[PDB]
């Protein structure tokens, strides 16, 4: 199969290059407009404040940028991201390999502990996921016994029926773990339907960009509402694990 | 297993809560550092530029923040959506790393990302399995020869197998963990510790995004920045093995 792997590799590269093109096309125009808007703001400020050089305003913006990059907020001038709830959640983001990173570690000690925390934590969680996966699948499988029986009593051809059970399966998961959360988050996080689906999927794929994080919002007095979602993550990931493995099989079928 | 899974669940929860405590203890002290630094920058600038009101510098910073949020870069090229950087971004998706050091702003970008990942991750998953095996068998072909030398000094062959496999991952580690840590130390102006943090956050596919190489072609070794994406590809199997061996060790648990 060594020939096939080189074919597969180039297929992936082509996929990445095509991804590159699509992304650039959709995203670069607004990155250039942002750059131009920053320039417009500088030139406007210079015109308004004659005691400021181009190069000195430059350092201001660089120093501001680095501080925002450290999680500083432009809105305030006063003076918890690491409250026990959020710190728990952060630990959760590691072992799940999601890694939102919407809050970064600042201490050398924090980073060094994180290494060993993950090295031990991820495989441990992997094991529990396998566990939850089997138990979940079994429970659903117990359920669909009734459903395929009704189709047999409805006299539906049997091979059709278990595809229909799995077809029922796919819908059932999606409703409870994709659609329910998207609806949940839409109301709770004040996101759009599309933002919420983007979040859900980026989450369950364990990509964890960190552009969208459920509960993170500072204002909300619902700290428990964050750990409760973390149970959704635990139940959801196996479901998605199944979907991900199965779509691979569909690609196996095509190849 | 019913006992086992609830036991395992409780173990993991305890682990999370203990993690929470350690992290909070180490990180809560320094939470306001970035705010302190932004305030220091403002107040230092007002002292230096008398014709600027606090409230006017305020709006400047808000307007700057919104522009950076749009992917503007402090400039004194640099496109994160040029073909090089965009390729790399696509790479961060299918690997499920997802640094997010550059975010999508268009609803179209997000919608395409969904289908790109949903189809892309399993495809890469399959190739990873494939590349994993090919290298693994080729490494094992190498392992046998090392096993022969151990065989010829009268080490019991089961002991030799463990020794070779231990040598197996140790060779992997040195090849893929230490070289990059040294590479990044020199290339990125990071500390040895920052670089190992980056490497491991990367190969675990956590992908915080606090530390990134970038794989944007610049100068001295511009081609080498996208070439790092190949280090990622070759490294991940090694780590896959390590994580699955710790998984087997947790099976032993």
């Amino acid at each position, epitope marked *: 199969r060594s020939t096939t792997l080189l074919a597969l590799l180039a297929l992936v590269l082509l996929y990445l290059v095509s991804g590159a093109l699509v992304f650039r096309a959709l995203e670069q125009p607004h990155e250039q407009q942002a750059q131009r808007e920053l*320039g*417009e703001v500088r*030139e406007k400020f*210079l*015109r308004a404040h*004659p*005691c*400021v*050089s*181009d*190069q*000195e305003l*430059g350092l201001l913006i660089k120093e501001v940028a680095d501080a925002l990059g450290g999680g500083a907020d432009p809105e305030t001038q006063s003076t918890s991201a690491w409250d026990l709830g959020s710190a728990f959640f952060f630990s959760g983001t590691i072992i799940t390999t999601i890694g939102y990173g919407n809050v970064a570690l600042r201490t050398d000690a924090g980073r060094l502990f994180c290494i060993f925390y993950a090295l031990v934590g991820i495989p441990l969680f992997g094991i529990l996921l396998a566990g939850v996966g089997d138990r979940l699948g079994s429970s659903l499988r117990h359920g669909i016994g009734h459903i395929e029986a009704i189709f047999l009593k409805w006299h539906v051809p049997p091979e059709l029926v278990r595809v229909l059970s799995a077809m029922l399966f796919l819908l059932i998961g999606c409703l409870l773990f994709v659609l329910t959360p998207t609806f949940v988050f839409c109301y709770m996080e004040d996101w759009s339907k599309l933002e919420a689906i983007y979040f859900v999927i980026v989450t369950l794929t364990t990509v964890g960009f960190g552009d969208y994080v459920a509960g993170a919002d500072p204002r909300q007095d619902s700290p428990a509402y964050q750990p409760l979602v973390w149970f959704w993550i635990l139940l959801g990931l196996p479901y998605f694990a199944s979907v991900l493995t199965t779509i691979g099989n569909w690609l196996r079928v095509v190849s | 297993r019913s006992t086992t899974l609830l036991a395992l669940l409780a173990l993991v929860l305890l682990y999370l809560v203990s993690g929470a405590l350690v992290f909070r203890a180490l990180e809560q002290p320094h939470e306001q550092q970035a705010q302190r630094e932004l305030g220091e920058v403002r107040e230092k600038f007002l002292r*230096a*530029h*008398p*014709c600027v009101s606090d409230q006017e510098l305020g709006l400047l910073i808000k307007e700057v923040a919104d522009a950076l949020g749009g992917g503007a870069d402090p400039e*004194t090229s640099h496109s994160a959506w040029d073909l090089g950087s965009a390729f790399f971004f696509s790479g961060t998706i299918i690997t499920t790393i997802g640094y997010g050091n550059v975010a999508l702003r268009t609803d179209a970008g997000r919608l395409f990302c969904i289908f790109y990942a949903l189809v892309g991750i399993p495809l890469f998953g399959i190739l990873l399995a494939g590349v994993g095996d090919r290298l693994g068998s080729s490494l094992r072909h190498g392992i046998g020869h090392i096993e022969a030398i151990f065989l010829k000094w009268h080490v019991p062959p089961e002991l030799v197998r463990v020794l070779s496999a231990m040598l197996f991952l140790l060779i992997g580690c040195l090849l893929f963990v230490l070289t990059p840590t040294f590479v990044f130390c020199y290339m990125e102006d990071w500390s040895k510790l920052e670089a190992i943090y980056f490497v491991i956050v990367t190969l675990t596919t956590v992908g915080f995004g606090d530390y990134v190489a970038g794989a944007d072609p610049r100068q001295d070794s511009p081609a080498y920045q996208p070439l790092v994406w190949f280090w990622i590809l070759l490294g991940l199997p090694y780590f896959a093995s390590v994580l699955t061996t710790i998984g087997n060790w947790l099976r032993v648990v």
Partner: antibody
Amino acid sequence: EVQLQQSGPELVKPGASMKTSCKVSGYSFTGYIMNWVKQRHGKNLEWIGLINPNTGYTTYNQKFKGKATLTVDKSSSTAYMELLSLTSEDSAIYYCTRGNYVFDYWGQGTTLTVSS
Amino acid sequence: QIVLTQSPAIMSASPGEKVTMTCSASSSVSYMHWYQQKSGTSPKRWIYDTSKLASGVPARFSGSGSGTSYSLTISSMEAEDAATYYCQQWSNSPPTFGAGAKLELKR
């Protein structure tokens, strides 16, 4: 009436350095950025660098990094430019001018002659 | 390192003639400024921020443009208008100038 009064023409030997001055009046020296411009013959005008008289902050055209030192005396509201190890290529008219985006007020200029 | 091109470098106008001289940028620029210089004397800020007239400048002068091309115009050439006109930019440090456009009287 804002006004930039430069010191008179200077003639110095090859290799010597030279310092010329620009005293401002009719506005606050420290409120506005001071720049220097080189006009060789009557041809292309070259920005040398700026100083912020209030902060002493300086940046130079990379072409003049080594050549020029900008300083100010806040009390005498005078800007200075120093040019180093002079060659015949430095023989030109030098202006001080004010501005952080347009050069809105200029000195009368000073002619540097480098010659044995 | 933005390059400003003023062509032609020398041009002549009869009095009453409309004159337009151009300044093209190597890459895009938000605003162009213009100076008038008459031999023996310093440049004078003539037009700034593309189309704003400096204090003394008579209304027969205008400026215009955007992106990579900018233009100074005299509605009706006058004798006192014979001079060198320079464009300059500061949308990018370091600020840069054109090599100048000398305007002579036709006779």
